[PDB]
Amino acid sequence: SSHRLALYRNQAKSLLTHGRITTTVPKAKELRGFVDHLIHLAKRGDLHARRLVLRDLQDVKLVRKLFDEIAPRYRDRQGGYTRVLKLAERRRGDGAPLALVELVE
Amino acid sequence: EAKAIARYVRISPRKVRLVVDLIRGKSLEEARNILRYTNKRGAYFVAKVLESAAANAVNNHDLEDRLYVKAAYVDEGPALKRVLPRARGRADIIKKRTSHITVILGEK
Amino acid sequence: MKRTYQPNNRKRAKTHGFRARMKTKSGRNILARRRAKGRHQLTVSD
Amino acid sequence: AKHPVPKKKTSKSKRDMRRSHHALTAPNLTECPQCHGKKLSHHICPNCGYYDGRQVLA
RNA sequence: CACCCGGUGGAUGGGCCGGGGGUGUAAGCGCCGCGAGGCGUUGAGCCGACCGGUCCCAAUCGUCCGAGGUCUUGACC
RNA sequence: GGACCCGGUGAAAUUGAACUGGCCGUGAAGAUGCGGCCUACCCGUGGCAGGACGAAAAGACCCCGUGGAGCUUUACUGCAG
RNA sequence: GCGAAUGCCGGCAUGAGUAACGAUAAAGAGGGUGAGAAUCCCUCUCGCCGUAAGCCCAAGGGUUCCUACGCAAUGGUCGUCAGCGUAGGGUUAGGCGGGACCUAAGGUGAAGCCGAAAGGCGUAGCCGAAGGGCAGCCGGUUAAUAUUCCGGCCCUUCCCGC
RNA sequence: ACCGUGAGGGAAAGGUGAAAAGAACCCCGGGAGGGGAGUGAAAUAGAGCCUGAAACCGUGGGCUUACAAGCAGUCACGGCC
RNA sequence: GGUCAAGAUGGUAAGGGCCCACGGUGGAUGCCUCGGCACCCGAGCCGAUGAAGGACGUGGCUACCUGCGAUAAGCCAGGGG
């Protein structure tokens, strides 16, 4: 619900900033598509597009940064602008097989 | 051949138990990745008691590698008699069943 | 919840305190009781 | 409120027998990509960074 | 858990893409009225699993275990 | 949101002991353990309550001890006033 | 001279690696330290208060407060974090509060009054309080104090002299 | 010490050795704790460290275990050791 | 030498039950003592020249135990050494 989002939110956020973070299996598996999806919008690129992407992310700097910045570095492909890579270790007490994901580059 | 150990070891004797019951009688180096990349706690520990083990030998008990663990075991003792909620009246304590940890390291 | 413990310097003290016990027959009694008898300290001492 | 509780000393025997079906199974791990060593079947590591791309450190 | 299909000589996930379905014509500029609003562009916009394309993405590489063919009698080649 | 699978921790009353099936019969008269019989591999985890006369508590209902304790009146006696 | 008294005392197994983490006000990411960090430090998104999950005066508890070292156990997991350990250090007032003033209840209580003894009562006087009364305030200043320490501004009572 | 506001209740816990000569140094390790050396008559006498039994948890070995009932078991006959 | 058809014994144990060896956990136990218990002979009052009993207190460097208390591990005088 409000939480599913939130996530996708900040994760989508932080990420674009670095372009490959460290969350567990799933977490990543999703932040992908979405974030992913988002991308495809930076690609659309315009009034609208932006008015969305931001709509969620909320933040000029980026929002723009990507739409212009990265977007391009991708204008060509077909989704997938992300390469979700699992990881070797696992957060303690837990034992969760975290994992890392980036913007396929 | 030589051996590693250590009592006053805080932990689930039991749990521990699985620990070896694996890497158990097997090539040094070998399991040395079992516990390196296995899971559940103890490991860490378990590992430890393999290094001062592999050590002790070569160092003062002597032929590296060719070694392993002819045998490995753990015992409980000393408890940790622990107090909990008074039956909301009378005491109910558990016991972090201290934990011993011996383990062989002889050469092929 | 109001147990029955809320101590009250003023209170507890007063109420109980070297003196008093003293002042009293009884009090006095036991007191010098306790004293020898046991050792220890005493109320107010508390 | 202990409606139901055991009724007869569980029997070490059995007891354990119970605790019997249990057991571990060493990590299926493999061996390095070029990292040379044993890794968590499918992953880089404090030995790797590779896979195909240098996405790590050391 | 066991059970089914797939493991880049792949269409298995997602992604994208067409397709459907679904909400009722958007963000903007435009033109009428002091304003409120309306009318247009514009059945727009946006689309969660539904039908199906395309190797953008991500199922790399690797291990382990596994047969041999038990004793007697006879029936045929 | 627990419950289920992971990792870290890790109790608790009751319990002689136990590898504890159904039957129809039985015995102190409502038996997994005795007889005859029929099904019957070894262990487990997620459950569902029936039986183990399940757990709680040496029945408060009962009677029995020429037990006890409280109130009652033209019960016995005695004191206070 | 002991199974054996739902016996007493001590240990030790049960159920059981299932039941619980003390409010369904959630988090997640980047860097940093460390032998080792979901659980510490900085930083950036996010959620919950907001009549409180605010500061304040009390009462109660008394070093729990700061600072440098450290994690064996207590922290219902960790833990380099602590309101945990050791060591050092911290809270100053003519004017704030209590007394150096006042009495009601009440308590004491020379005299006085009655008890088998211990005792009972009890005048005046005394004890007795955020009730009466009384002479200040704003800023600064350390790891902690502050109407007390700084300083600027405002006072009171006693004493000696004239 | 500890529960009790109070009057009051009221525990547990002794033992290395001849004496410390109480373990310098080197080793794995964040440490505790474990491997050697040295004291030594002995340290499986080693720091809550004399004797240190049982219950109860382990590590290996012999035998034994998947058409099988009883805590028990004890009498017969058989194979492995 | 191969094929069919039948007929009967064996190995393999996740854990498990018994036997053996080696730990661990736990402290029984024996023997022992700076302590009691018990009975008998000694003794038999302390107090304002503020007792019995506490309070906070000095050791150079500190909680406790102690003995004192300000002239605080002690200051004088005589006997023993």
Position A96: which residue type? A
Distance CA B68, CA B28 (A): 4
D16 CA, F28 C1': Å apart: 39
How was this structure obtained?
Answer: X-ray
User: Smallest CA–C1' separation from A39: which nucleotide?
Assistant: E15
Q: Which phi-psi region, left, alpha or beta, contains residue B82 (left: φ > 0; alpha: ψ -120 to 50)?
A: beta
Site of tokens 């009293």: C24
Alpha helices by DSSP H, C1-46: 10-13, 28-38
Q: Is the CB of C38 under 7 A from strand H?
A: yes
Q: Which phi-psi region, left, alpha or beta, contains residue B49 (left: φ > 0; alpha: ψ -120 to 50)?
A: alpha
Instruction: Kindly report the CATH class assigned to B1-108.
Output: alpha beta
Pairing of strands A20-22, A100-102: antiparallel
- Could you give the C-alpha distances from A45 to A41, A90, C18, in angstroms and in order? 6, 38, 88
Cβ atoms within 10 Å, residue A65: 15
Helix pair A2-18, A47-57: axis angle to 10 deg: 110
Whether residue D45 and residue A102 make contact (CB cut-off 8 A), yes or no, is no
Assess D55–A contact: CB distance below 8 Å, yes or no: yes
Q: By the 8 A CB rule, do C37 and C44 touch?
A: no
Distance CA A71, CA A63 (A): 10
B9 CA, G100 C1': Å apart: 65
> Which domains, and CATH codes, for chain C?
1-46 (1.10.287.3980)
Q: Is the CB of B74 under 7 A from strand H?
A: yes
Distance CA A40, CA A63 (A): 13
**Size of chain B in residues:** 108
Chain Cα centroid distance, residue A96: 21
List the end-to-end C-alpha distance of chain A, in Å, as a whole number: 32
- Domain edges within chain B: 1-108
Q: Distance, in angstroms, between D24 CA and closest chain A CA?
A: 16
Q: Domain span at residue A27?
A: 1-105
- Which of B27, B33, B46 is most worth mutating to test chain D (most D CB atoms within 10 A of its CB)? B33
User: Which tokens go with A32?
Assistant: 């992908």
Q: What angle do CA A50, A67, A49 make, to 5 degrees?
A: 25
Q: What is the CATH number of the domain that holds A37?
A: 3.90.1030.10
Contacts of A95 in chain B (CB under 8 A): 39-40
Contacts of B31 in chain D (CB under 8 A): 26
Structural domains in chain A (count): 1
C25 CA, F79 C1': Å apart: 31
Which pairs with CB-CB distance under 8 Å and at least 24 residues apart come from D46-50? Answer: D48/A88
Distance CA B57, CA B62 (A): 5
Cβ atoms within 10 Å, residue D46: 13
User: Which tokens go with A12?
Assistant: 């989508």
- Domain edges within chain D: 5-58
Q: By the 8 A CB rule, do A43 and A74 touch?
A: yes
Position A87: which residue type? L
Site of tokens 């450190």: D57
Distance CA B32, CA A64 (A): 51
